[PDB]
């Protein structure tokens, strides 16, 4: 049921943190105020879309974790490096 059952183990707090983690991994936020800049806001939006997409794909928190950390890896090791 719901988002493949596992949903109950990932509350909005954890979601928000993970979004933050993605954002930070993409662009290391100097201070929360930075989030107010459209440049950053776009990254925040993208991070939310990614996080949501992963959530709505993964059949387990484990898989979700893999995909999120994998995403972080790719964005640095694949993309820029």
């Amino acid at each position: 049921g719901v988002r493949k059952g596992w949903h109950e183990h990932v509350t909005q707090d954890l979601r928000s943190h993970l979004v933050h983690k993605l954002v930070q991994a993409i662009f290391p936020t100097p201070d929360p105020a930075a989030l107010k800049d459209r440049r950053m806001e776009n990254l925040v939006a993208y991070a939310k879309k990614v996080e949501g997409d992963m959530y709505e794909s993964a059949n387990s928190r484990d898989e979700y974790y893999h995909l999120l950390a994998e995403k972080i890896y790719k964005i640095q090791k694949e993309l820029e490096e």
Partner: peptide, 28 residues
């Protein structure tokens, strides 16, 4: 399949594991 590929290859590049660990340690 793509899962397996990415995981299998990235498991050969432990910075991925460091990121996993960091994600676990950082995110509740």
């Amino acid at each position: 399949t793509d899962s397996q590929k990415r995981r299998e290859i990235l498991s050969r590049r432990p910075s991925y594991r460091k990121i996993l660990n960091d994600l676990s340690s950082d995110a509740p």
